[PDB]
Each structure stands twice: as structure tokens, then as C-alpha cells.
């Protein structure tokens, strides 16, 4: 029970982390490639972004 | 004695409230200081940016 309630949560956690990393990459990459823009500060905050 | 004292047996409500209000006041007061400090850091980051 432990082993399959720990392996399960680990698998789900790694998938969720990988998904959150991917969704961040997609969020930040456009601004990352525009050196100049006004970032949406709510999106600058919710993702890691070093605003202007 | 037919009982055993327990190191809380004399504190009483009044002294409890005193220790309470004192510690709470200090904790809140430090929390104020920390809050004003973090708020100044965030204000400066928006001040640059």
C-alpha cells in the first residue's frame, strides 16, 4: 500500500512537475525572445520573469 | 500535600494574559518590521521596473 501509494504519488508528482516546467517554458519563451516588451505583470509574477 | 504541583499551577489567568499580550505584542511588532522591509524591497523592484 505504502509502496503503491508512494510510487503513484511520485509518478504523478514528476509528471505534474514536468508539465509545469513545460507550461512555464511556453509562457516565458515569447517574452524571452522579445527583449523589449511590457510583460503582463501577472504573467511576469506567476512565472519566473525579471520585468522591465 | 495530597496533590502534585505541575509548573503551571500558579500561573493564573491574569499572568497568562500578561505573558500572552506581551509575547503577542513583540511578535506582531517584529512582524511589522519584517513587513515594512519586504514591502520596501518589492516597492523598489517595481521602482526600477
Amino acid at each position: 500500500g505504502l509502496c503503491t501509494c508512494v510510487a503513484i504519488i511520485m509518478v504523478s508528482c514528476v509528471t505534474s512537475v514536468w508539465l509545469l516546467c513545460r507550461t512555464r517554458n511556453l509562457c516565458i519563451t515569447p517574452y524571452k525572445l522579445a527583449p523589449n516588451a511590457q510583460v503582463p505583470i501577472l504573467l511576469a509574477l506567476l512565472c519566473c520573469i525579471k520585468p522591465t | 500535600a495530597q496533590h502534585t504541583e505541575s509548573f503551571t499551577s500558579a500561573i493564573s489567568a491574569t499572568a497568562w494574559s500578561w505573558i500572552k499580550v506581551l509575547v503577542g505584542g513583540t511578535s506582531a511588532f517584529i512582524v511589522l518590521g519584517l513587513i515594512a522591509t519586504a514591502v520596501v524591497a518589492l516597492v523598489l523592484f517595481f521602482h526600477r521596473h
Binding site: 527583449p35 523589449n36 | 523598489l44 521602482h47 526600477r48
Partner: protein
Amino acid sequence: DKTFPIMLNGQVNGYACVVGGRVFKPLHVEGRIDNEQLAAIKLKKASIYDLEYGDVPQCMKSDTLQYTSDKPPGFYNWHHGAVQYENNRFTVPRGVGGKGDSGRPILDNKGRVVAIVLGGVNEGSRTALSVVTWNQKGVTVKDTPEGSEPW
């Protein structure tokens, strides 16, 4: 002149300067100012901006470089030549400036200081300067490119 070399071991370490009502000088530069009428006025340091500020004598007062926070991109002068303001950065052609150039003002075309330099990096055919600017509201802010060094 209206900016003064602070001195150490005879060899000017940093030109400090007189802006808008206050002599300013960078904290890292360590030196006697070379103007007796300033060389002792206590300095109020602030490390968040790497600078030290102090009121100029009430007689000195009416010599004091003007300033302004409105700096549209373009050409601005500088002792060692022209500086260019593009893409919210001040840049200088390569190899001009270094140890000794700290704290000299950057003036506009009407002659008012817009910035006081604190450092640099040579980046290809140009040099980005780490500087102290008066932001769009007039608040002072230290703008520094990455890796910039104390001049």
C-alpha cells in the same frame, strides 16, 4: 571646474561631482576631494546606489549642475567623448574609460546631468556603462549591465 578629481596617492582615483544641489561621490572610490571647500563636508552614504551625498556650501550653491529625468534616446556628451542612449542603456565606444573614470557626469545637449557613471563592461565594439539615472518619475535608480565592474 564643475567636477572635482578626488585624489589618492596623488593619482586621481575617481572624478566626483556636483549635481543639482548635492555633491555626489561613489562609495568605492576612496579619496580626498581636491577642493578644500568640499574636502571635509560630511557625506551621507547610501550603498543601494553606491554613492555618498552632501550639501554644497551656501556660497558654492549657484554653480551646481542641473539635472532632469527626461532623457529621450539619442546623443549625450561626456568628457571622453559622446555617449549614446539606446534601448534603455548608455553606451560608449570601446576602450575609452576605466579605473579613474568613476563618477564623472553624463550631460545632455542643454548641459544638464542625466547620469553619473559607476562602471562598465566592454561589449564588442562598444561599452555599456553602469550608471545612476533618474527614472521616469524622477526617482534615482542604479542601472547596471550584467558583469559590470567598479571603475
